[PDB]
Amino acid sequence: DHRKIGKQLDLYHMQEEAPGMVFWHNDGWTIFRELEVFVRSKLKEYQYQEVKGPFMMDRVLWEKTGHWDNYKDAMFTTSSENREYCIKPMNCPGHVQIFNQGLKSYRDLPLRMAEFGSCHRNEPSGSLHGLMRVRGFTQDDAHIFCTEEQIRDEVNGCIRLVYDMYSTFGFEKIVVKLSTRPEKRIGSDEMWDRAEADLAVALEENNIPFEYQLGEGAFYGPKIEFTLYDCLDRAWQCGTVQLDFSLPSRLSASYVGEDNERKVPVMIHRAILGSMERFIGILTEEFAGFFPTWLAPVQVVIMNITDSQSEYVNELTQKLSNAGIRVKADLRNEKIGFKIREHTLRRVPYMLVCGDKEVESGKVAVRTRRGKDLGSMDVNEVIEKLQQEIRSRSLKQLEE
Amino acid sequence: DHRKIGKQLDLYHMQEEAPGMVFWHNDGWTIFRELEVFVRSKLKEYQYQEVKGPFMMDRVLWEKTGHWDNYKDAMFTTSSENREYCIKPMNCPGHVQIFNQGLKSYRDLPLRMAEFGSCHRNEPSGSLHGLMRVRGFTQDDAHIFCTEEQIRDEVNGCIRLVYDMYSTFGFEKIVVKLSTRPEKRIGSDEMWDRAEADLAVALEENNIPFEYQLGEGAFYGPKIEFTLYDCLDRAWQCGTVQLDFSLPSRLSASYVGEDNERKVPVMIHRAILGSMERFIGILTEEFAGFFPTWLAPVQVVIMNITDSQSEYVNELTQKLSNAGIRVKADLRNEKIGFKIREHTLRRVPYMLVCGDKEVESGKVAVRTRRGKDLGSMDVNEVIEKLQQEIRSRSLKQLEE
Ligand SMILES: O=C(O)c1cc(S(=O)(=O)Nc2ccc(Cc3ccccc3)cc2)ccc1O
Ligand SMILES: O=C(O)c1cc(S(=O)(=O)Nc2ccc(Cc3ccccc3)cc2)ccc1O
């Protein structure tokens, strides 16, 4: 259960005065920020722009998209100078506004536009659940503006990216669903037929088995949903790929084609992790708090036995910190076995013990959060290997 | 004027349907993110935690702090399930909530807690100006919880950090103001006397000349204000250091002292850049769009003359990109002179031209956005020097 593990590792907390709002503590924010860096490296590789849209836009714009009519109950609203604003539940309209600055042509397409977009949705309080279902969350979101001829490759690209990213966390159980047209929707039947068919053909061409999930699509288009499970085998939508022939038209998006006529771009929506919040909840439960070294808030703790070795521990801490490792010293006058138990409960990958022998030899005794005693080793070697474990974003520690 | 420069370099835009809200385009967001990385490197060096508080909190909490009575008209409110929430105009209360999780002692102090905190303030629309005065902005904010004996060193730390960071951008107009007690305020007169005296002593010990700005302090404490000027020599509050003996008490913050009695922590508020938005407006005008290489959205553009060299350009682009440089290839079927002009107008620091001779020799012809022609040079040398210019965050290029 990620809520208990979350308290025990001091990752985050929640309070009545802000239901479904996460207060990220230093250590949870470290995880979050590490996820950002990882995502960003993929955005670079798969050629995405990164942008940032505003939190609020005029209610008039949300009426034009169909959100007001189809999504009103999940929207926070506010006002200023006799005008109403909606806090964004989604990043797409913001992205279209950016697309609409400056003349576009087919030469600019496909245009891939990513955002770590803070969304707010007024979910019923009784549906809230730790980090999985919150009122304020951050999507690793993007929108791809493309031609009709480009849809197949771009949808394939999103799917490639899901499996690429998910294999770093080592996911076996990726159940895939295709969520079809809901009762309340925009666009014609033909648009929905085409959009559902293309997502389905994409999955089939990639040899991905999936089930239909009738009526669980968005009002602006169907979804491929990559489903992950928690400790009670509850299904949680994480990765999501959507196809939309409606919003660009409504927000007057256009580009000049080769013909030289105005054409409306197709819009692909996708989020790989889903939200950072939910994904971290899934990870917390998947790993039972044993985060891979690259995600771990504290990667190394260095301990002395007596005051005799505190000097050496501080030098070592400095050294590791300079090598770019998240490290802490534990100099408390506590029995070493007491210290090991505490940092094991905090899921610290590596615990370095410094007795007189380690001092004398410039060595360090290594223990892991799994109770494994790896013996004395040369410091430079431990540093080099920690860096390799981090750089490769390895699932498994030294040995395993 | 940063608004015109902003349009012509595609950094950001603004629209009527979101007054005082910035839409960051890819290139503006790159600058913003580079400022984050820079700030973060300083947070590491000066030993800050980094956290993230929620956007919304219950109106009741804002009444407790005195914001509802003293700051109401600048606050956006929304509601859910018959409760009212405020969109945070500040990060301090959020930080205190985090501080209040888990028992604290003097051993934890000083506790430095930083956030890139998205603030929203309902400024009068007639006061809005480009990026300088907006409704939605991101403070490079922090709050330092400390004892009374620690105030001097911690305030000195904030001041050291301002001049440290500002010298990277090369500021030689740092006018400093000391903003004293406003008419509407919390805390006693003795608290205000002490707080004004300490800020004044701090400025004088650092040999900083300043003017008083009587009555322009915050309701929760006096401010040191570091003032930067725009192209029309208008004064803009950027860096800010505040001293607060009142908010922690109101939010029931406490720690166990050495004596072993409950004490209320002193709180120092500070923002070095101020907001990212304002600071970027200042920089845009200060540099007239010629950002230092480390800040530049695109650092290098590589161009071919004919199709003959496209292969070589792609290999080179790959190489530079892997060396960690923000690089683009320009393979359009355009005259080279046309291409160079375009990237010069966009203030790309370096333009690499590849003709048959560069191909044959594994060399590259380098020019700058200033029209400086550096001749043909070895590629590895160009890479090495670009990396040095970036790592050192130097103001001046290869050339000047
Ligand atoms: O275009 C969009 O607005 C968009 C919407 C979704 S979604 O709302 O269908 N998918 C989604 C699923 C889970 C999360 C995490 C989460 C956490 C709490 C509540 C709701 C969602 C976020 C998005 C996904 C990608 C998009 O570009
Ligand atoms: O923690 C702080 O530093 C802090 C600072 C302020 S401040 O408003 O005095 N500092 C400041 C200076 C410039 C900007 C940029 C800005 C401000 C208003 C509108 C637009 C941009 C932001 C904050 C208010 C509350 C705080 O907790």
Decide the pairing of beta strands B255-256 and A111-120.
unpaired
User: Residue A359: CB partners within 8 Å, gap ≥ 6?
Assistant: A308, A309, A312
Any idea what DSSP says for residue A74? G
For A47, counting Cβ atoms within 10 Å of its Cβ (0-12 exposed, 13-18 middle, 19+ buried), the class is exposed
Which is it for the CA torsion B96, B99, B104, B106, positive or negative?
Answer: negative
Question: Tokens 């600058």 — which residue?
Answer: B31
Contact B98 A21 (CB under 8 A): no
The H or E element that residue A386 is part of is helix A379-391
CA A246 to centroid of ligand 2, rounded, Å: 40
Cα dihedral across residues B329, B335, B340, B342: positive or negative: negative
Tokens of B308: 């003959």
For chain A, how many residues are written? 400
Q: Is A160 on the interface with B (CB under 8 A)?
A: no
Q: What does DSSP say about strands A77-80 and A255-256: parallel, antiparallel, or unpaired?
A: unpaired
Inter-CA distances, B107 with A20, A348, B253, B260, Å: 32, 22, 15, 12
The two most distant CA atoms of chain A are separated, in Å, by 80
Q: Are B363 and B376 in contact (CB under 8 A)?
A: yes
| Placement of tokens 């965050």 in the chain | B393
Query: Do the beta carbons of residue A131 and residue A11 sit within 8 Å?
Result: no
**Pairing between β-strand B49-50 and β-strand B111-120 as defined by DSSP bridges:** parallel
Which candidate from A15, A24, A52 shows the least CB-CB separation from B51?
A24
Of B50, B76, B98, the CB nearest to A78: B76
Contacts of A187 (CB under 8 A, 6+ apart): A195, A220, A221, A245, A246
The first and second tokens of residue A188, run together, are 């014609």
The answer to whether the Cβ–Cβ distance between B33 and A50 falls below 8 Å is yes
Are the C-beta atoms of B323 and B383 separated by less than 8 Å? Answer: yes
Pick the closest to residue A328 from A7, A6, A10 (CA basis). A10
CA A316 – CA A321 distance, rounded (Å):
8
Q: What is the spatial distance between Cα B342 and Cα B340, in angstroms, rounded to a whole number?
A: 5
Give yes or no for a contact between B224 and B71, defined as CB atoms under 8 angstroms apart.
no
For residues B279 and B72, give the distance between their C-alpha atoms in angstroms, rounded to a whole number. Answer: 26
Give me A361's structure tokens: 């030899």
Q: Could you give the 3-state DSSP secondary structure of residue B170?
A: coil
For B27, the token pair is 């290139």
Is A92 within any annotated ligand binding site? yes
Q: Of chain B residues 34-73, which have a CB less than 8 A from chain A? A: 49-58, 60-61
Provide the terminal-to-terminal Cα distance of chain B, rounded to the nearest Å: 24
Domains of chain A in sequence order: 2-287 (3.30.930.10), 300-391 (3.40.50.800)
The residue type of A337 is G
Task: Say if residues A330 and A303 touch (Cβ distance below 8 Å).
Answer: yes
Distances from the Cα of A138 to the Cα of A57, A277, A363, B277, angstroms: 18, 7, 43, 21
A22 to chain B, any CB pair closer than 8 A? The answer is yes
Is A24 in a helix, a strand, or coil?
Answer: strand
- Mutation target among A17, A43, A68, A127 for the B interface, most CBs of B within 10 A: A17
Rounded to whole angstroms, the Cα distance separating B112 from B269 reads 10
Which residue, among A100, A98, A23, A90, has the nearest Cα to A55 in the 3D structure? A90
**Contact partners, residue B115, CB within 8 Å, separation at least 6:** B50, B51, B52, B53, B91, B94, B95, B139, B141, B142
- Residues B321 and B254: their CA atoms lie apart, in Å, by 50
Relative to beta strand A77-80, strand A235-244 is unpaired
Closest by CA to B88, choosing from B43, B138, B14, is: B138
Quick check: B61 and A85 CB within 8 A? no
Contact B254, B262 (CB under 8 A): yes
At position B67, the amino acid (one-letter code) is H
Quick check: A82 contacting B, CB < 8 Å?
Answer: no
* CA B185 from centre of chain: 28
Q: What is the largest CA-CA distance in chain B?
A: 79
Rounded CA-CA distance B136/B87 in Å is 10
Structural contact between residues A303 and A353, judged by C-beta atoms closer than 8 angstroms: yes
C-alpha A84/C-alpha A212 separation (Å) is 38
Instruction: Name the residue at shortest CA distance from atom 26 of ligand 2.
Output: B90
Residues just before a chain gap in chain A (C–N exceeding 2.5 Å) are: none
- Nearest CB to A18; choose among B52, B56, B79: B56
Please name the residue that has the structure tokens 């839409």. Answer: B23
- Tokens read off for B259: 């004596």
Note whether B203 and B176 are within 8 A (CB). yes
Paired tokens of A349: 């990958």
Residue type for B328, please? K
CA distances from A177 to A218, A227, A233, A273, A391 (A): 13, 8, 16, 16, 33
Q: Count CB atoms within 10 A of the CB of residue A28.
A: 24
Q: CA–CA separation, B134 vs B19, rounded Å?
A: 8
> Which ligand is nearest to the Cα of residue B94, counting in written order?
2
H helices present in B232-378, as ranges = 247-250, 276-287, 310-322, 336-345, 356-361
Nearest CA distance, B22 vs chain A (angstrom): 6
* Token pair belonging to A400: 């395993």
Amino acid at A4: K
Catalytic residues of B: 92, 121, 139, 141, 143, 223, 269
Q: How far is the CA of A178 from the centre of ligand 1 (A)?
A: 15
Cβ-proximal residues to B166 (8 Å cutoff; 6+ apart), any chain: B174, B226, B239
The closest ligand to the CA of A223 turns out to be 1
Are B22 and A52 inside 8 Å of each other by CB?
yes
Say whether B101 and A50 touch across the interface (CB within 8 A).
no
Q: Which of B87, B225, B240 to mutate to test the pocket of ligand 2 (most atoms within 8 A of CB)?
A: B240
The total number of residues shown for chain B amounts to 400
What resolution (Å)? 2.5
**Distances A37 to A42, A295, A393, B276 between C-alpha atoms, Å:** 9, 11, 12, 20
In the sheet where B235-244 sits, what is the strand order?
B49-50, B111-120, B136-146, B266-275, B235-244, B223-229, B175-179, B210-213
Verify whether the Cβ–Cβ distance A94 to B23 is below 8 Å: yes
B96 and B246 Cβ atoms separated by less than 8 Å: no
Spatial distance between the Cα atoms of B222 and B202, rounded to a whole number of angstroms: 13
d(CA A299, CA A308): 24
Q: Among A66, A60, A62, A59, which residue's Cα sits nearest to residue A187?
A: A66
CA of A96 to the centre of ligand 1 (A): 17
Cβ separation A25–B51 shorter than 8 A = yes
* Beta carbons within 10 angstroms of residue A114's beta carbon: 27
Which of B7, B10, B21 to mutate: most A Cβ within 10 Å? Answer: B21
Whether the CB-CB separation of B97 and A23 falls below 8 Å is answered with: yes
Contacts of B113 in chain A (CB under 8 A): 26
Is residue B169 classed as helix, strand or coil in its secondary structure?
A: helix
Pocket test for ligand 2, best of B122, B162, B275 (most atoms within 8 A of CB): B275
Burial class (CB in 10 A: 0-12, 13-18, 19+), A374: middle
| Dist. CA B201–CA B176, nearest whole Å | 14
Asked if A167 has any chain B CB less than 8 Å from its own CB, the reply is no
Q: Which of A21, A134, A240, A245 to mutate to test the pocket of ligand 1 (most atoms within 8 A of CB)?
A: A240
d(CA B3, CA B126) in angstroms, rounded, equals 17
